[PDB]
Chain A
């Protein structure tokens, strides 16, 4: 849908169908996935020490 850009003090808000891009049909189905990248090798302090 698409709202009409109604200025000048009117209480009704009409709506109209509008096709436009083809991208929105896929955006109706990929609204639930983001892609993330793994990162290993953290580093943290603790109480141990390497012997010679």
Chain B
């Protein structure tokens, strides 16, 4: 069937390519994140720094709508005043490294928007199952 197809790369392998092709593989970029006489203190503080970072990320993802989905969607509409880009060009033109410098200004606000949105949705569905 397949004579020669693109198999898979290492973690950060796709990161030069476009975001549409890079979104096919996330599990590789996710798995290489946890694990694979004064010096023991340096190794132990390295390991606990690693698990501290990963647990912070898991909690920050948990307080939004999606705990463990690894791909989410939500109910906050995109304001075009941040990005001013077409839909047709971003998924077939740019990389994430290219993307991050463009969206670097508008951060730390979108997170709070997600927080408030998830909070209001939870209290409204709470009221729904309250009258249920």
Using a CB–CB cutoff of 8 Å, the interface residues on chain A facing chain B are: 46-51
A-B contact pairs, 11 of them (CB 8 A): A46-B130, A47-B130, A48-B126, A48-B129, A48-B130, A48-B132, A49-B129, A49-B132, A50-B129, A51-B129, A51-B132
Query: What is the CB-to-nearest-CB distance from B110 to chain A, in angstroms, rounded to a whole number?
Result: 27
Determine the interface band of chain B, counting residues with CB < 8 A from chain A.
under 10
Secondary structure at the B interface, as helix, strand, loop or mixed, is helix
Chain B residues with Cβ below 8 Å from A46 are 130
Chain A residues with Cβ below 8 Å from B129 are 48-51
Interface flags, B105-131, vs A, CB<8A=1, else 0 = 000000000000000000000100110
